[PDB]
């Protein structure tokens, strides 16, 4: 994978070329107005230590930081998702804990309104391939990756609310 980070708009001023996971990136710039990522599927982080705002990133130019949804110009880490291939699955529940009834998703879901009846979701478990959880349908408000593994409530994916409107599985364009 490879990303590049500016610190002005359109390509513009100092600049870092990342490739690997970074959980601090303000060694290398001091704030992020545009990006290019050349290859690889990335979540992108607010703060260090990949917390904050989360915005998902794939191959593209992205010369403003709306281009990916962006509250600001504060990228501080970075994560390159793990490329899978296959089967993406994951699990979701209306109650934490893995309780209530479940439902098994493995494909892209732009409205889990629109095809549960659901508003929210308090437990997941992802079972193949990574994730991403949007807070509303379409692929819209607060982005939270999903790594494989248990989020037997919402903190564990980093949330604020059990709102959950849509998911996406982290595939390249091709």
């Not at 601090?24 to 979540?43: A, K």
């Not at 699990?91 to 893995?98: A, H, N």
């Not at 939270?144 to 709102?163: I, Q, S, T, V």
Request: net charge neutral; charged share 25%; glycine share 8%.
């Amino acid at each position: 994978g490879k990303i590049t980070f500016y610190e002005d708009r359109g390509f513009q001023g100092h600049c870092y070329e990342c490739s690997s996971d970074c959980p601090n990136l303000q060694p290398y710039f001091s704030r992020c107005n545009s990006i290019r990522v050349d290859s690889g599927c990335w979540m992108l982080y607010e703060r260090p230590n990949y917390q904050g705002h989360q915005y998902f990133l794939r191959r593209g130019d992205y010369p403003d930081y709306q281009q990916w949804m962006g509250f600001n110009d504060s990228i501080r880490s970075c994560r390159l998702i793990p490329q899978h291939t296959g089967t993406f699955r994951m699990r979701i529940y209306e109650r934490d804990d893995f309780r209530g009834q479940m439902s098994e998703i493995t494909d892209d879901c732009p409205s889990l309104q629109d095809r549960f009846h659901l508003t929210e979701v308090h437990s997941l478990n992802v079972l193949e391939g990574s994730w991403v959880l949007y807070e509303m349908p379409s692929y819209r408000g607060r982005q939270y990756l999903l790594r494989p593994g248990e989020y037997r409530r919402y903190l564990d994916w980093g949330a604020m609310n059990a709102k959950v409107g849509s998911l996406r599985r982290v595939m390249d364009f091709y």
